[PDB]
Design a protein around this ligand. Structure first.
Ligand SMILES: Nc1nc2c(ncn2[C@@H]2O[C@H](COP(=O)(O)OP(=O)(O)O)[C@@H](O)[C@H]2O)c(=O)[nH]1
Ligand SMILES: Nc1nc2c(ncn2[C@@H]2O[C@H](COP(=O)(O)OP(=O)(O)O)[C@@H](O)[C@H]2O)c(=O)[nH]1
Ligand SMILES: Nc1nc2c(ncn2[C@@H]2O[C@H](COP(=O)(O)OP(=O)(O)O)[C@@H](O)[C@H]2O)c(=O)[nH]1
Ligand code: ALF
Ligand code: ALF
Ligand code: ALF
Ligand SMILES: [Ca+2]
Ligand SMILES: [Ca+2]
Ligand SMILES: [Ca+2]
Ligand SMILES: [Ca+2]
Ligand SMILES: [Ca+2]
Ligand SMILES: [Ca+2]
Ligand SMILES: [Ca+2]
Lengths: 418, 147, 434, 431, 68
DNA sequence: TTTTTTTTTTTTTT
């Protein structure tokens, strides 16, 4: 019934706030937004002023901005200096404006869509005159809700936002591991899925100060920790397995244990959980300690909410939705490991494409970002350049698509930079 | 705007009428239209029956059509034989069915457009979850409407 | 509830008899009086046959005379009911079909009636099981055992149609029986381009497929009086007409698309346009059609103007009927069938251009064989006639005797197989006799 | 309106089991629990079998133990009802008879039920008449252990001897004779119930050969032959036969450009072909069921001898959805053999061949080459390939010669036979 | 992308760095010959729709002839 | 909707 034009004027305030706090934060903000993207009339005017002052450039602080707003009839229209003062105290830091700007922008696009859709329907009843050209306008008007490098742009001239993974090249392409993202890491069996996830978890939990929850549905907590120890200290896994450790290995282990203690990584190895359970547990850990990342050791191993044992494709379709929504609710990146269907092993080229994600196509469709792992040496016994592993970033609606290379020293359960 | 979906019932009846009059006029008619293009539930069923009988082919006259409509539960649903009789008389001759068919068709497309645009707007307020795939659906749903 | 019946249809039959009345012959071949549901129609249709046995013959008078001759005229409604029957049948030339409805409904209730009496007997004769099951078996066949109607063409009847058809032929001047292409040597070998034939013209890319098809279309449309439909899925209508103009007037194609025309070229163009106007060639350049669409369009053009030929610019470009994106070989297998079936239904030659696989270029002898037809072998099979185009000069840059082009007639179930030779002056988009 | 049943006999069966209980063996060979009419007996006889599968075995104790093990002991009357069942029959010595009563009653109400549902469907599905009949036919046969007793060899040997006897008292081709001597020697007909596959590349001579056979059968013998042409019209077929019957050049015939002696030839070609009795159905799409129906009827009133089908892969499938096409034709293949078997008449199915063969050195076909499904090789009683050297060689020495390669037959001998195929006359001739 | 560039600036030519590098529409990674058979048609169709020459670069198997 | 195993017609893989 009551239809409220979509907006988040909390997030709006968070953007303007960050600018008064930083103000190098105006660069990302304006790359992402124009003044009109803001819903509240007042913010429109403020963010306009902010850019107006940057074009001088003054630069942009609480003073100069009010100076610019008074320079036009506008300072009284937007609330007082007292409103501009509130905007400042909105956020603790001008950390991650990029995040909130992208919310404001996404909402803007939504109502632009709604508006052009309603005006198409509107015109459906009126211009009953020229059917084929009405269909062209509809085509064209729906594309224009979306907003090719020129030769000149390409002449800038010859000759992390972001929870950081610790893999430079991936981080450059991605910049974290962003709050609220669903990150899918899929690859054939025994290729390196878990290894890669665990490596990321360590570098986050040890290098940063954030807590990470890992749900392992296949491996025990014990086996997980043993993988991390080997990777932290470069101890050969076979040796560690057996207890057959060299005198310096003991040193390496003593160390590895040290650093992993203050690491703060919470592991849940219950073999059958529903997403609701996962949510519950994380909600509580965030409550009392704060959460940074959630890792899930594997999406199709999670189990369904009651809908009866439904068309299994729908069952996972649903798990997929739930996870994204959990990532959204807790404002935290969620890395979900996925399997792939065997169809890749038919191809003469064994690099996965999005279609290959096992069991339900909705996973491609819910993910904020899809990463495949490919290893030449998985297939070739003799393969030249062994330890190399491609991290194919097949999808991301932050930005760039592409492949990144790392080394996967298997004896050490370890991924390394090159 | 109205809330009056685009249609042209002068024209639907004119098509069905021409078929009972000719009935070689069913050939142009069906090239141009499928039963669903008709707005009135009743005409849908009738034009379907007409094609159903042509596939035998009987062929298509006021008798065989009512025989086919009664063969399903439908003869009473579409008005009587008395409505089929009216359809016959809602026409001089069946020259240029192609013309009126293309009107019926064009109106069909209009409401199909209106219907998909409203459902896009509808979905705009609900599925605030995805943005990029919501824009994909809109892209894709509007192409599917040029057929 | 209500037993299956059609009075709309019963009346239509009786009506047609009072209208024709030669319509009583099909009617009675298909029906006996008992097949009618309404007690009254039973009696009327009986009277009709009763009067036919004299024979009177059957009209509104004699019938009422016969019905009054028994106690029956008042029982069936009045003369006023017989009068209504007259007025209540749309077109009397298809009594066959209304009769078949009345007949089909008759069979239905006969089935219902024997099925209910089986169930009936199930409770009663609980005595001898095996002979009860045999009777059920046997009683249900005796429904299927429906009399007259049952398509097997008796040979006595066909032979007559053949003699009479031969006869007709024998009084035509003669030579070509079909639609003449205007290429003498090909026409001698083929004699048209026969109604209902599927003609496949296949050859490697840029060899001359379309060129050859268009040339045939012109010579048919301008030399004869027949209409020809051309479906072009690759080229536009305007490119097609531009090819015909060049060929009709011997205007150099490069000159023509530049507008760089000599003073006599204009003359040639003025003529070309003149004759191509009264030509009557209907062009459909929609780049994706289903065969169903083609059928539909042709059916209508034949309706109001009459059709002679259908040309299709190429078969593997046509698109499938829904069966999902099936084993592609099957998809075209089906298109193939549909085309032959279309030529059959419209009683008109259908010339389908086809591509060839890379097979032939691998061979030493680059001349195509049937196997080479691209994408599905069913095309060789379905075709009435398969023509390949081979140009030596297509492969040899230097080739001795250039403009010559073989028309290899690799298949025909009319008659003779063989090769024919023509010249293909490419500068003029033109095929010529030798 | 009271369902056929025989409770007395039901009790007698259950009784005998509690009495014997080796009587359960015959009982279960004859009955399943559902055959019993009384809800209670159903459950009891189920329990009996359930306990036998352990096996306990089956007595008044173990049975009540099993019935109490489910919620059922109170539902079937008490232990007191099971006790009555024991006392109901004298001895166990003839469960077989009571079982057969229960069974016969079961069949009765199964019949009544399918009959009522046929009448039921009569008012509803007024849509398709011919496929509604077939279902009735088929639904009423399914009312038996109709798929089910062994045939003893002593008995077969006799009917075999007696057959050999009669064969001898003939008249030795066994056999509908094709009129091609060398083929007939190898084959002896064209036997009742055989499926004969004639396959060859396009425009090689498939139809021509089949038609020639049909004539010589229909005119030389007195038997009726049905031809289903799915590709050519009835007219085109008759025109081929006229040319072959009278040696009239086909080109002349289809122009009307006939010599004075040609009309003579035509006049008596027509003459002999009239009393020929060949029934032609040229409907371009039929299912095998349709073919079956039409033949069944023609045999009914005139008797049938041969069925010719202008061509197996052109036939269309029974509903199973547009299935793996190989299975679709796999099925048509089965149906055809089963039709030949049911009508006790040779069925000649023409077949196409895959392009496989065009790839070879030796262009003589092998069984594998049959187009679209390998089940055809397997189902066929006999597989005949046509090969023509002159089909591939433009210049070929000895033109009109054509091999009839008999690649398969489970009557007997395999081998090649030679004929001449005078194409100008649509005619195959002996050598 | 081209539809949009033509929309606001007008297009004249499209050049593509190479045809067999383009990737398939979902049909499962089909008989690869069909996959590019498809790309081929799509391209022609695109050239036709935008009324603009499309230059597609192509590789050759194994003076070339068309078969290659 | 998807994942699996089978048979059998096509094209194109240096
Ligand atoms: N050489 C060596 N390789 C190992 C050792 N331990 C594990 N690996 C390899 O490292 C990989 C880790 O398993 P993983 O890929 O995470 O399982 P996933 O979830 O299917 O991807 C496997 O491919 C193992 O073969 C070891 O002790 N020595
Ligand atoms: N000299 C000359 N030759 C041409 C001209 N236009 C076309 N041709 C040749 O004429 C033929 C016509 O195309 P076509 O063979 O019908 O295409 P197809 O459908 O693949 O058979 C081509 O093979 C051309 O290379 C022209 O303007 N001048
Ligand atoms: N010379 C000549 N050959 C003919 C004539 N009529 C038919 N043929 C040939 O006879 C053969 C008929 O083969 P057919 O059985 O219809 O092909 P199939 O059904 O696929 O085996 C073809 O090879 C034709 O070329 C004719 O009048 N003259
Ligand atoms: F081998 Al895994 F997930 F444990 F693919
Ligand atoms: F030009 Al083409 F087949 F090569 F039509
Ligand atoms: F071409 Al055919 F049977 F006449 F395959
Ligand atoms: Ca794992
Ligand atoms: Ca979803
Ligand atoms: Ca998939
Ligand atoms: Ca997002
Ligand atoms: Ca062409
Ligand atoms: Ca044939
Ligand atoms: Ca006779």
């Amino acid at each position: 019934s009551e239809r409220i034009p979509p907006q988040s004027i909390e997030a709006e305030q968070a953007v303007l706030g960050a600018v008064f706090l930083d103000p190098a934060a105006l660069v990302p903000a304006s790359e992402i937004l124009i003044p009109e993207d803001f819903y509240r009339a007042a913010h429109q005017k403020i963010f306009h002023a902010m850019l107006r002052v940057a074009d001088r450039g003054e630069p942009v602080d609480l003073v100069t901005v009010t100076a610019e707003l008074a320079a036009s009839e506008q300072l009284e229209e937007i609330g007082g200096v007292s409103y501009l003062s509130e905007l400042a105290d909105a956020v603790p830091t001008a950390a991650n404006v990029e995040y909130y700007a992208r919310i404001v922008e996404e909402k803007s696009v939504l109502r632009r869509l709604i508006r052009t859709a309603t005006s198409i329907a509107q015109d459906g009843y009126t211009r009953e005159d020229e059917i084929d050209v009405l269909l062209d306008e509809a085509d064209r008007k729906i594309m224009e809700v979306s907003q090719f490098k020129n030769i000149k742009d390409i002449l800038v001239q010859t000759y992390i936002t972001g929870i950081p993974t610790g893999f430079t090249e991936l981080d450059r392409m991605t910049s974290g591991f962003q709050r609220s993202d669903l990150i899918i890491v899929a690859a054939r069996p025994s290729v390196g899925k878990t290894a890669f996830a665990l490596n990321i978890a360590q570098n986050v939990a040890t290098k940063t100060n954030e807590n990470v929850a890992i749900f392992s549905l296949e491996m025990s907590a014990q086996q997980l920790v043993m993988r991390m120890l080997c990777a932290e200290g470069n101890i050969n896994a076979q040796n560690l397995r057996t207890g057959k450790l060299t005198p310096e290995d003991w040193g390496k282990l003593t160390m590895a244990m040290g650093s992993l203690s203050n690491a703060g990584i919470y592991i849940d190895d219950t073999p059958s959980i529903r997403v609701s359970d996962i949510r519950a547990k994380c909600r509580r850990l965030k409550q009392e300690s704060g959460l940074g990342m959630i890792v899930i050791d594997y999406l199709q191993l999670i189990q369904g909410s009651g809908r009866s044992k439904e068309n299994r494709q729908q069952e996972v379709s649903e798990i997929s939705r739930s996870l994204k929504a959990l990532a959204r609710e807790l404002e935290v990146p969620v890395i979900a490991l996925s399997q792939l269907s065997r169809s890749v092993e038919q191809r003469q080229d064994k690099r996965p494409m999005m279609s290959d994600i096992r069991e339900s196509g909705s996973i491609e469709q819910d993910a904020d970002i899809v990463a495949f792992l490919y290893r030449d040496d998985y297939y070739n016994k003799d393969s030249e350049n062994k330890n190399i592993i491609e991290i194919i970033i097949a999808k991301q609606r932050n930005g760039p698509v592409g492949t990144v290379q790392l080394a996967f020293i298997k004896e050490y359960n370890k991924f390394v930079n090159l | 705007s109205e809330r009056i979906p685009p249609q042209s019932i002068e024209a639907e009846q004119a098509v069905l009428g021409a078929v009972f009059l000719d009935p070689a006029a069913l050939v142009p008619a069906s090239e141009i239209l499928i039963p669903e293009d008709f707005y009135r539930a009743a005409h849908q069923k009738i034009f379907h029956a007409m094609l159903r009988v042509a596939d035998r082919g009987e062929p298509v006259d006021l008798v065989t059509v009512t025989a086919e409509l009664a063969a399903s539960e439908q003869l009473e649903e579409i008005g009587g034989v008395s409505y089929l009789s009216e359809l016959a008389d809602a026409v001089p001759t069946a020259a240029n069915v192609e013309y009126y068919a293309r009107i019926v068709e064009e109106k069909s497309v209009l409401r199909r457009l209106i219907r998909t645009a409203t459902s896009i707007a509808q979905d705009g307020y609900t599925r605030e979850d995805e943005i990029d795939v919501l824009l994909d659906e809109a892209d894709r749903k509007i192409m599917e409407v040029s057929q």
